[model samples]
Target: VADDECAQFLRQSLAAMLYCEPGQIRDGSRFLELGLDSVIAAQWIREINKHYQLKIPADGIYTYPVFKAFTQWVGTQLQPTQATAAPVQREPVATAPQPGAQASAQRESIQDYLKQSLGELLFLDPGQLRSGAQFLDLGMDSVTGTQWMRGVSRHFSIQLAADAIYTWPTLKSLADEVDRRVQ
Candidate 1:
């Protein structure tokens, strides 16, 4: 499973960063307890972001301090977009109607749009903007926040308060609010 691979990768990466043997990095140990500071944590996160194409903040070390927990979170984040190069294909089929499926799909599209817009505003790739990531972690400042809010308002014809960025800080939450209002 990808979890094993992720754990191996994490172990090796941590070992390299800490200048220790991979076996010394225990899965249950907190990163801080292993002598990881912000300076090293930032570098580690950047390496992980590059390897996994994720936008996990440097503070993720504090959020998921334990090795096992961090590995699980990264594995889930990778799940949605993985295995794309497989040789198997299936024909599309009509399915039974599901309540709120259309609404959920609409919200997903809105989230994608918001991610794209935020990426452009921040000069980052859209893939770097995880749906659950905080805007502040992604480098959103007051100046860029105003521009992003104005752009969203003009594009969606929805009036957003100046603090809307702070109110709905993540892509998923912001998209949910926008979808609710747009409906």
Candidate 2:
């Protein structure tokens, strides 16, 4: 994702499929109601690949039913590389704060942090993360999941047992472990 463009790219990309002006879309809108079906979805994937360099499988994008859930998950696919032009940085989680955290909550909650981390992993909205959902359900493989695991470790100071995140896979369970450790 470009430094200033992640949000806009996400909005316009969806807007194109929705047949709505990008200005009309808020982040919370749903993708299913936009008449997104398999055929059109495949075309969208091709377009996304052309523009974003990320070739999302049409099958994968269609699995999730709505924008909130789907976008939260897909946003991860565009994560910044070290070679990013501006090189957007991620500091230690200590800087971001937490609820009841030794450092008081700042801009986001633990859930928000998890969403950001996993959203990068799953390339979707962190808020779309669900309680009992599996990370694999979002089409993650071992490599990307490992990167996600590492990002979580940096944020929490407690490495999530790789198995736990890969297995339990729910937002509630993972967030619980994060909450327990961030103190």
Candidate 3:
């Protein structure tokens, strides 16, 4: 199913859990502000795991507090199991590239991907994530950093140290590190 479908299901389920109408739940609304405590979050995660047949972390609500962010993350989690998934085919083009331009473009793409992923993880808009901003300044702690590392490592299919966030520190630095490893 698509992200929207997953979002719709989440909205309905959240509404049912809160004993309210689905329309009352906004996509950008924070679960904490919407009256979900640790216990409710754990119960909601359990229900979602049962429905999706997947094991999402119990503190997932705290990780992706906004409704839209949580739904986006869940959609990504479900994508690997889609039955009709197909491999992407890229046709080679015989176009000459300017010196360093291709490498620059590749690095920018990696940075953009990281920005989007991190933004969702932190419940921030991707555009608001400054490339030079320190993760600690952005409110990252050991708990959130560990969770982010897990998600990033899984997505990149790479092994990263627990202190990788501290080592990289900023989005640009982290993106550069990820690009170096992935390349």
- The alpha-carbon deviation from the true structure for residue 139 of candidate 1, after best TM-score superposition, in angstroms, is 78
Candidate 1, 1-183: lDDT as tens digits? 564777788778787877889866567888888877788878877788788887774555677989778865665555455657654456233453664655367777766787788778778774665648676644636787778777777788888776777686665776677778888
lDDT of each: 0.72, 0.62, 0.71
List runs of model 2 lying over 4 Å from the truth.
Answer: 1-108
Q: What ranking of all candidate models by lDDT puts the best one first?
A: 1, 3, 2
What TM-score against the true fold does each predicted structure earn?
0.41, 0.36, 0.41
Candidate 2 lDDT over residue span 17-127, tens digit each = 667797765555555666667787777667766776665656555566655556544566775763656533554443434535444563247667767676766666656
Q: What is the clash count for each candidate, in the order shown? A: 0, 17, 0
Question: Once model 2 is optimally superposed onto the true structure by TM-score, how far is the C-alpha of residue 67 displaced, in angstroms?
Answer: 85
Query: Distance from true position, residue 29, model 1, in Å?
Result: 1.3
Ranking by TM-score: 3, 1, 2
Give the C-alpha miss distance for residue 123 in model 3, angstroms. Answer: 1.0
Q: Candidate 1: misplaced stretches above 4 Å?
A: 82-183
lDDT of 2: 0.62
Clashing pairs in 3: none
Task: Give me the candidate number with maximum lDDT.
Answer: 1
- Give one digit per residue, the lDDT tens place, for model 3 in 48-165: 8889867776556767889778865665556465676545435244454654656466677766676677777778774666648776644546677677767777777888776767
What TM-score would you give candidate 1 relative to the actual structure?
0.41
